[PDB]
Amino acid sequence: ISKEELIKLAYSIRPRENEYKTILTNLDEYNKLTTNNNENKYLQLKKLNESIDVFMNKYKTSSRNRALSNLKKDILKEVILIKNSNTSPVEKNLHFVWIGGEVSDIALEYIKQWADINAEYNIKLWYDSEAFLVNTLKKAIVESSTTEALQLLEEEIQNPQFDNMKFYKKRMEFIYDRQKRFINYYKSQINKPTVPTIDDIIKSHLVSEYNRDETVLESYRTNSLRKINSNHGIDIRANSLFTEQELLNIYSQELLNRGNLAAASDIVRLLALKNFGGVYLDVDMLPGIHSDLFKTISRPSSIGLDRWEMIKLEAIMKYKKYINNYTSENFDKLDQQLKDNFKLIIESKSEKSEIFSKLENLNVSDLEIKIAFALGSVINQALISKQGSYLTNLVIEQVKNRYQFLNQHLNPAIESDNNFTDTTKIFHDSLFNSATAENSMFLTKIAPYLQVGFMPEARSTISLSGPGAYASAYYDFINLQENTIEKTLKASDLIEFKFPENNLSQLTEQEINSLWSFDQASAKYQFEKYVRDYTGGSLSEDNGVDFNKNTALDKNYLLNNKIPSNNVEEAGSKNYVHYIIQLQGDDISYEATCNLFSKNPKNSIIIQRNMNESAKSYFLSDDGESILELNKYRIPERLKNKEKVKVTFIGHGKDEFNTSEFARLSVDSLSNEISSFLDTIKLDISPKNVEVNLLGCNMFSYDFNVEETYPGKLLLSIMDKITSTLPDVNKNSITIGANQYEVRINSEGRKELLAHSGKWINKEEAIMSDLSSKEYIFFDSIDNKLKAKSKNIPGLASISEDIKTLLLDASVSPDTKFILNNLKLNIESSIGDYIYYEKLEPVKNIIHNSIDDLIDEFNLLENVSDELYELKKLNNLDEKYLISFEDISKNNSTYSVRFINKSNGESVYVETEKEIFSKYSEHITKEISTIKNSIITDVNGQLDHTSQVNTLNAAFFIQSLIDYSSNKDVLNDLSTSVKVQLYAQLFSTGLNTIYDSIQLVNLISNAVNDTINVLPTITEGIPIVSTILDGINLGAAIKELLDEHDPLLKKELEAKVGVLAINMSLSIAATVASIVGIGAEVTIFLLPIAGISAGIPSLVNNELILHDKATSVVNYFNHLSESKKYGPLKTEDDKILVPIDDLVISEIDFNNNSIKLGTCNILAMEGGSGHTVTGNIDHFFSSPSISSHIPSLSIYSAIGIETENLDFSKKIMMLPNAPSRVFWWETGAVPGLRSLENDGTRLLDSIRDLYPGKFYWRFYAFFDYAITTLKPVYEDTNIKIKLDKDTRNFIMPTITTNEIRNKLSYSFDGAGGTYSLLLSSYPISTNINLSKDDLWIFNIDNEVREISIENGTIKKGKLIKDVLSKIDINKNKLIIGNQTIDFSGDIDNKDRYIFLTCELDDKISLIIEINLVAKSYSLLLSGDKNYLISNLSNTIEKINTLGLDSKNIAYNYTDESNNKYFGAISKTSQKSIIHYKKDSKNILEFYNDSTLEFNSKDFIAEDINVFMKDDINTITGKYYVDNNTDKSIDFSISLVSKNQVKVNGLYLNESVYSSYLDFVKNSDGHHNTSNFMNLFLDNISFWKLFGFENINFVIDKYFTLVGKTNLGYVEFICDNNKNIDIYFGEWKTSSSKSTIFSGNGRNVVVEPIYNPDTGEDISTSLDFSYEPLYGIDRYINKVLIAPDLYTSLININTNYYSNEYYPEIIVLNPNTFHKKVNINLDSSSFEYKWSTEGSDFILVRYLEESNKKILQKIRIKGILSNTQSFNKMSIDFKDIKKLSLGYIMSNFKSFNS
Ligand SMILES: [Zn+2]
């Protein structure tokens, strides 16, 4: 009913197809106008359905096919809706048919029951008034012909070994010739213009050529015309039933030519319902009984279901009568309590009115026709149909087409007047020349058409005017097709056409007898009566030989005749014990017991029960050569463990149709004997099942109603009496077989027969018929009724194969040829019925094989998919309704499925009775649980993936479901539902635990758009070894470290997993080299503190006084002048530029070579009275210095300032320690010191001269006055430092007084160079402007160590604890106690780092690699290798002393002459590896403390990487085998001892893995373990990459190997014990991929490659060959090829003869829209044999090449399940192409299994 939905629901990248446009048009026109009624609605979707097929077959690879096949599923639903729509009562008519003669009084009483209860309806019994002597004629011909055949073979008949078929054949020859005489006599009296009625011509023919009288015959016509008319009679010739001539011809063909009144009746049935209302019944039917009549009565477990329905009818008629002599025989016996109960419940009702049910008004459709059922198949004993009902026409259309085919071949055969023998030979040859694959079974079913009704085992009526035509017409209506010959019916579709059970009452005394088929079983006794009447004779089948001569076993005869001269060997498994029991003392049963024992003398025993007292169980001993004896019916020891109990009772039987007495034992008489023998057996064996054989004359296995028939009556008695005696015997695993003969194979190879004659004779037809007639009856699994297990399919084939070779040769009777041919066809027809009736159940292995588990999963998915689609369709759910399998609740009667709305986050619940969702729920949650519980551990978490052992199996199916829901793909809905469920389970609680709408939407969204990989996919390079440590898989983490290329993210990972990978880049080695060298230079030479030269101020009462005396002040100006005369900076030791002490430097400019000076001032004075100067001495009258309200004087301005063009050649420089300031000062009475001459006095005079009347420091004013003190006030200043690209080294001045220090602040401006700054013990504010984030080194020597001042200089001491225990890092600011370095001009440069350095030792340097952005740091050591290793124990101690927390320490050092050293150290355990390249060859050393625990003077490898983590070290790299570039090996290596080296895992490329596979091929010693993998390294000479030869590697438990074939990869794992096995393998060909994974067993799953982009065309082929299985063929159990909808071709290349073992290839049978699917084998048709194990078909190829036996088995699952699946298949060979499986069963040799 999909309208606009289908389009856009079925998209393909291709433009809209032409035929698809037709579908859309037809799909619309069915929805555009849906006006009632139904017949038009049916034909329209029939157009649509056909329209789809036209497309789906033209564009097989189109992406629209999946959704169009969905529509067809919906269209099939539509046909059902249309049918059960128009529910209106059917017309009021009952139809019965009696044609050919006089209606029996029995029938009339049956019909009278309906007319009385259903007075509403009026019975219109049909009859052919022109033909009342047809039945009278058939008898006349049969009787006359029977007598003719008897006289023809009168001599032959007296022979006991005379097959009764030569009679029936010779008779049929006479029947036919006598029939033609009538047909010709008829043809000669119809052409005449005067028209004589049919039985009028019959009357003339009977009295002429036969001994009849017209007066008698005409009397039989009169009283059969009034009798039929009085009893609701209506003529067929008087009403226009045969308005169509084609039907009258068919009817007349069955009425006149062949004496088939039954087949003629079938034609009248259909037409009566085509013209009138539809309720048809037979004369053996009865009205339905009320379901309340026997409601209170329980059903004994002694009688069958069918018999229970019989006795209910029988209980009525015994008193209520309604029948003259109704037989209540089965009801009479032994239950008086229930016999009295039935009487009252019937006597307590109104007479006849309420005894049965009433049809009332039966509502049927204008289309449908309802037919009665019988044991799962349709039968036309009851019919219901609207007039001209659509299906009623289909049955008629069927019948016509059946006869159209029949007569097309039969008429030309019949036309040429030949005898029966040659007429049939023409017909058969005519049939199987037009034979196809679709009508093959129909042909063999209509081949004995002429013989029908005159020869046994010939039933063509069924396939022409019988149930076969009905069933075919049903399939026609259901699947919207026309003219189906023989296609399967599913009982789930038959139910809606089933006749209402409350009205049937099918089982009746007459109906039971009408079901007795005309077989060779009944032909046995009917023939006997013919001879019994022809001659006054006697019984011979028992009489004549049946004696009491109880001969005991001749041990010599049984050992040196029977056992050795036996030629019969059975292929069935010998796990069984056989109880051959002789019941009678004739010489016939004796010779039989000795022969049956000879077949398997080591499994069977002999018990001559015929001797009641001396009944001992003879058998062959544990050894041969003698027959040991043993009383008490028991068995030897070796036959006690047997699973199967086989028992054969040998004895003669009563000469009666359906015998009731076997060997003078009644039904209940043998049961008491079986019970009084079974108890004696229980002490030796407790079997799982039992098989009861009954051998002897007149012992057949009947077709219908085996219940109420020996030994069907016997199985009931034994069943409950054997299941309580022998435990472990399934309630229904009890088979019983009735055989008549015993067969041997003589010295020439011909099957022989032990008849009552007492001699073994060659009666082929008797033997072959008996072997094929035998059946095994058991109890139904559903406890329903008694069913017969299907015969051995390769068995019946083996029989027909024997028949063919008999028919092939010329030395065999034409009489026997004819019968064996009819037998062959009957056998061939039987095999075909098993596929048509769906009687073949799937294989149930004794043990749950691993391959079956897979098959049950693929099948499970297909069911849950379709059932979900049907569930969502019935309940109208869009694409926004996600099913929650976690929420399949179970109400009282139905389940309750939750559907989460993906849009609003709400959920809706729907109820279904289907338990498929419930079961898939349990399985899918279990799998998901297995996945989550494989992602350990709990503490750390989001990918971990610590997969192991079996957990891959769950991971496979889930991952295969996840990937189906590829991003931005619509279907399947199921695929996403599991993906969401899994997602919710991994990152949240259960999906069933989430009710929040907003949460659900966001979850489902993220679940869909993210990608989850629960399945490990193999990659090139180092394999991931699952070695758990500290909650992290180190092997997994390492693999990421090799693959992560962003050096930062690589460092980020190292910080997380606590793993240190060593760096070998020469860029880092050089960087470190420059850094360590700078620190060493700067930290060694000691320098003075500020300020020993200028003088350190001493605070006194809230003001700073720099100097006390005038002499001290002059000295300051002396120092100040001395300074700026040598320049603003001083050079010392030709190493460092030091500024003048207390000289205010405001700005240093390196790239321009200039300096800015700050403000250094001194207060001015004012207003002197009298000024004179005499001899450099000023005289005054007290000029006061302001204190202070007057402008300041510049001290520096008077000094020789020299700013520009300085020599900044030196890289090392001391930082200025002088803040800008203004000097407060006063004068004091100072005597003497006149004409004191210093460079400061001159400078002081330079201030005096430059500043007239503003400054005077020494003067006379009635007293000698001079500048007494000098007290400064510091204003905080900033020293901006402008750098160049050149490298600059800086030292921070150590300032004692806090007042001076706090005023200072530094500002650096980078320029892409190397800058270093030695930190002072006393913190000075600093800020750095990062340009290019160039090299910035910081020596923390003075802040990490203990510091004190000696004679004005700094002395570094011991290290202070916990200094670096607290380090603060930010992109804008770095804090290391005590200094705080701010960072401005911050380029957010992720790349470049910051370095901290200090000297732990004279030669050992520590380096801290810091990233501002990353907010973290790393540790590094530099120095001499040998010296470090020695002092390692205590230098690692130093690092812990400082407070550094880094778990691992890197080692980088460049030596003199430029040779570099690399390595890493673990802070704990003190283990370290060191690598370097001396003389171009690689050298690595493994150290533990000061001990060398491994060495390698030469290490041949590339891409070398060293990893450190606690005790564990890992070395990766690529190695070349035998120095060959193609031979590439990637290795994971752990160093442990001086000699032994641990191997973690290996990777092998195509060339090396081929060397491995070849090594593995010849590896089997046959068994030397565990030195296997150690031996491969010996072959590869893996030691040769190391230096020395004497090495022993160790293979870890978690060792992981991986090789690369040209199709994929295979990853091996070492098991619990050291055993190598396949963990996970995956290779893809052009069309498909194969997957093998640890858990599912050792199987390979072949799946078609799924392309994500759906729109593009899909592949329609699968490819398999044994070639990818080379070398690893020992690791593989079986191969499972699993195709999908888009698969029609399976290419299997079977000519790869390089493997010893070939896995069984199992091909699954999925549903497909394709018409045909093919398996193309690249081998010949011969070399192949076929077999059958349950539902699946088997082809096995045997070939002998290179002195090697080759057996290639191929099993196609469940093909024989139904006709639909059986005809999908075709098989291609190199010689013959396109072969049906039916053809293969016919032209290939079969074999048992
Ligand atoms: Zn007998």
Distance 652 CA to ligand 1 centre (A): 4
Tokens coding 1118: 């002396």
Residue 895: in which H helix or E strand, if any?
strand 895-901
List Cβ neighbours of 30 (8 Å cut-off, separation of 6 or more): 41, 44, 45, 47, 48
End-to-end CA distance of the chain: 50
Tokens coding 1498: 């030469």
Cα(977)–Cα(1007) distance, rounded to whole angstroms? Answer: 10
Distance 542 CA to ligand 1 centre (A): 4
Of 652, 1119, 1475, 1714, the catalytic one is 652
- Decide if 594 is catalytic: no
548 among annotated binding-site residues: yes
> Does 1574 sit behind a cis peptide bond, omega within 30 degrees of 0 on the bond before it?
no
Tokens coding 86: 């128009």
Quick check: 531 and 150 in contact, CB under 8 A?
yes
Distance 616 CA to ligand 1 centre (A): 24
Distance 817 CA to ligand 1 centre (A): 27
- For the chain, the residues before each gap (C–N > 2.5 Å) are 941
Resolution to one decimal, Å: 3.3
Cα(1269)–Cα(1730) distance, rounded to whole angstroms? Answer: 125
Cα(265)–Cα(286) distance, rounded to whole angstroms? Answer: 19
Cα(424)–Cα(175) distance, rounded to whole angstroms? Answer: 14
Quick check: 1186 and 1165 in contact, CB under 8 A?
yes
How far, in Å, are 77, 856, 1639, 1662, 1739 from residue 1707 at the CA level? 30, 13, 21, 11, 11
Q: DSSP of 1537-1598, one letter per residue?
A: SSS-EEEEEEEE-HHHHHHHHHHHHTT-SS---S-SHHHHHHHHTGGGGSS-S---EEEEEE
Cα(12)–Cα(9) distance, rounded to whole angstroms? Answer: 10
- How crowded is residue 1401: how many other Cβ atoms within 10 Å of its Cβ? 15
Residues in the chain: 1793
Distance 1726 CA to ligand 1 centre (A): 45
98 among annotated binding-site residues: yes
1538 among annotated binding-site residues: no
* Phi, psi for residue 592 in degrees, rounded to 5: -75, -45
920 among annotated binding-site residues: no
Tokens coding 59: 């564009």
* Phi, psi for residue 1623 in degrees, rounded to 5: -90, -60
Distance 158 CA to ligand 1 centre (A): 17
Dihedral sign computed on CA atoms, order 411, 412, 414, 420: negative
How far, in Å, are 94, 197, 635, 1713 from residue 229 at the CA level? 16, 18, 71, 56
Q: Can you name the residues that pair with 371 across neighbouring β-strands?
A: 383, 498
Distance 741 CA to ligand 1 centre (A): 10
3-state per-residue secondary structure call for 1584-1647: HHCCCCCCCEEEEEEEEEEEECCCEEEEEEECCCCCEEEEEEEEECCCEEEEEECCCCCCEEEE
1757 among annotated binding-site residues: no
751 among annotated binding-site residues: yes
1115 among annotated binding-site residues: no
- Give the architecture-level CATH label for domain 520-837: 3-Layer(aba) Sandwich (3.40)
126 among annotated binding-site residues: no
Closest CA to 953 of 1643, 1629, 1755: 1643
Cα(164)–Cα(157) distance, rounded to whole angstroms? Answer: 9
At position 789, the amino acid (one-letter code) is K
Closest CA to 1464 of 1404, 1514, 1537: 1514
Distance 700 CA to ligand 1 centre (A): 13
Cα(469)–Cα(1210) distance, rounded to whole angstroms? Answer: 115
Cα(1334)–Cα(1260) distance, rounded to whole angstroms? Answer: 61
Of 428, 578, 594, 697, the catalytic one is 697
Distance 1383 CA to ligand 1 centre (A): 117
Helix (H, G, I), strand (E, B) or coil at 1421: strand
Distance 1700 CA to ligand 1 centre (A): 55
14 among annotated binding-site residues: no
Dihedral sign computed on CA atoms, order 976, 980, 985, 991: negative
Closest CA to 227 of 135, 105, 337: 105
Closest CA to 1751 of 1707, 1713, 1702, 1784: 1702
1707 among annotated binding-site residues: no
How far, in Å, are 55, 1061, 1476, 1580, 1588 from residue 1499 at the CA level? 67, 18, 10, 16, 10
Distance 710 CA to ligand 1 centre (A): 16
- Decide if 290 is catalytic: no
Distance 541 CA to ligand 1 centre (A): 5
Tokens coding 81: 């809706």
Dihedral sign computed on CA atoms, order 7, 12, 18, 19: negative
- Report, in angstroms and rounded to the nearest whole number, the Rg of the chain calculated over CA atoms: 55
Helix axes 214-222, 198-209, angle to 10 degrees: 150
Quick check: 98 and 107 in contact, CB under 8 A?
yes
Dihedral sign computed on CA atoms, order 1238, 1243, 1249, 1253: negative
576 among annotated binding-site residues: yes
282 among annotated binding-site residues: yes
Cα(1120)–Cα(1247) distance, rounded to whole angstroms? Answer: 13
Closest CA to 827 of 742, 887, 895, 770: 770
